[PDB]
Amino acid sequence: VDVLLGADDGSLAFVPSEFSVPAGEKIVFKNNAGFPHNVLFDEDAVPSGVDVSKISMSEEDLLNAKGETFEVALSDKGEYTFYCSPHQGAGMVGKVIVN
């Protein structure tokens, strides 16, 4: 599944911001517009047992050009909250349900 970073209209959003994927499906976060963006998972809002450092970008790494990607496959079932570091305080966050 592809998830865009930034809406075409400049909105600070993941697109889609909530979605479900079967365990193991590769999620491709694709830098779209109004960057910089990046993608991290929230240690306080993932399934028990998940280590968010293995599935997040480094906080200092920013995608600054359209078409860059960050790709991850989530294997543990449950809810995961991801966020963009620059824009987390502007509501650029989302939720994937791995089933």
Cite the active site residues: 37, 84, 87, 92
Stretch that binds Cu ion, among 20-28, 47-55, 71-79, 82-90 (CB under 5 A): 82-90
* Distance from C-alpha of 97 to C-alpha of 76, rounded to nearest angstrom: 10
String of contacts with Cu ion for each residue 28-67, x by CB under 5 A? ---------x------------------------------
Q: Which amino acid is at 22?
A: P
- Tokens 């570091």 belong to 85
Choosing from 46, 87, 93, 98, the residue that interacts with Cu ion (CB under 5 A) is 87
Residue 25 has what DSSP assignment? P
Q: What are phi and psi of 54, to 5 degrees?
A: -80, -10
For the chain, helix, strand, coil in percent to 5 are 5, 35, 55
* C-beta of 78 vs 86, nearer to Cu ion: 86
Choosing from 40, 92, 96, 98, the residue that interacts with Cu ion (CB under 5 A) is 92
Has 84 been labeled as part of a binding site? yes
